[PDB]
């Protein structure tokens, strides 16, 4: 099984998470294309210790609600593609997220 490329969009418009955003949710989106990945795939992101979890569509995105305090309080993740080939071999593709907080 082939890794393909994985992103991760500016958290929030700005890349920073401000009062406000940190006192509701956040979606952190980002893309998930190339290699055996595919929709359906697992993505997932530790966030603050706390795993959180979606699944690339069907256009090779994703997004994932996630608290906005553990944002504040964490400013860098990987999300973590887990992709099959035809056979049922594996693999895991990463990338990485930083961001600040005002
Ligand atoms: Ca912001
Ligand atoms: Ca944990
Ligand atoms: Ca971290
Ligand atoms: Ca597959
Ligand atoms: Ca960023
Ligand atoms: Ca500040
Ligand atoms: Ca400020």
Same mark, same amino acid.
């Given at each position: 099984?082939?890794?393909?490329?994985?992103?991760?969009?500016? #958290?929030?418009?700005?890349?920073?998470?401000?009062?406000?955003?940190?006192?509701? $949710? %956040?979606? !952190? @989106?980002?893309?998930? $294309?190339?290699? /055996? #990945? *595919?929709?359906? /795939? +697992?993505?997932? =992101?530790? #966030?603050?210790?706390?795993?959180? $979890?979606?699944? !690339? /569509? *069907?256009?090779?995105?994703?997004? !994932? &609600?996630? *608290?906005?305090?553990? =944002?504040?309080?964490?400013? *860098?993740? &990987?999300? %973590? %593609? +887990?992709? @099959?080939?035809?056979?049922?071999?594996?693999?895991?593709?990463?990338? @990485?997220?930083?961001? $600040? %907080?005002?």
């Amino acid at each position: 099984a082939t890794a393909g490329t994985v992103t991760v969009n500016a #958290i929030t418009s700005d890349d920073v998470i401000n009062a406000s955003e940190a006192a509701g $949710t %956040v979606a !952190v @989106s980002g893309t998930a $294309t190339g290699g /055996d #990945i *595919a929709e359906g /795939d +697992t993505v997932t =992101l530790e #966030i603050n210790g706390e795993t959180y $979890t979606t699944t !690339v /569509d *069907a256009n090779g995105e994703w997004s !994932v &609600d996630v *608290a906005g305090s553990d =944002l504040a309080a964490d400013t *860098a993740f &990987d999300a %973590v %593609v +887990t992709s @099959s080939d035809a056979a049922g071999n594996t693999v895991d593709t990463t990338g @990485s997220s930083t961001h $600040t %907080v005002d």
